[PDB]
Design a protein around this nucleic acid. Structure first.
Lengths: 61, 56
DNA sequence: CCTCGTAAAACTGTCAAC
DNA sequence: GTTGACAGTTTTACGAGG
């Protein structure tokens, strides 16, 4: 498995702009954002998966 | 304490500000010549990042 | 991709402590 | 002042299963 290598505070800024716009990603933007952030097309596809769970975590109560 | 330990682990940090994280293979080598546990190196690096880097 | 759950790196948050 | 340490919570990254 790939070792834990968290992301720059500027990369998490690129995301959460998009996530806040749409909770889901287009294969277009799945590319467009990846190049600017130099993230893998795979990884960015995982970030939303996790980030989605987070919003259900905020559910509260 | 100890001292030189700190002086070792400060050298590695200031060497890479870019990527201030070790590979578990590197940490092993740090633990290998420190006298410190792997846990201690992890813990210290965890501190050192919030202890030092943030203003930088 | 997609919850959902499960590892394991790395973050708070605080603390007596020497 | 800040150093080392820790339970508890957050972030990364896969794999089952539908």
């Amino acid at each position: 498995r790939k070792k834990r290598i968290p992301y720059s505070k500027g990369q998490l800024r690129e995301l959460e702009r998009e996530y806040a716009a749409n909770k889901f990603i287009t294969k277009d933007k799945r590319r467009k954002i990846s190049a600017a952030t130099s993230l893998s097309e795979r990884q960015i596809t995982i970030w939303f998966q996790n980030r989605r769970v987070k919003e259900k975590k905020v559910l509260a109560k | 304490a100890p001292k030189v330990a700190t002086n070792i682990m400060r050298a590695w940090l200031f060497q890479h500000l870019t990527h201030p994280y070790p590979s578990e293979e590197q940490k092993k080598q740090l633990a290998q010549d420190t006298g410190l546990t792997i846990l201690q190196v992890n813990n210290w690096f965890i501190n050192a990042r919030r202890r030092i880097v943030q203003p930088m």
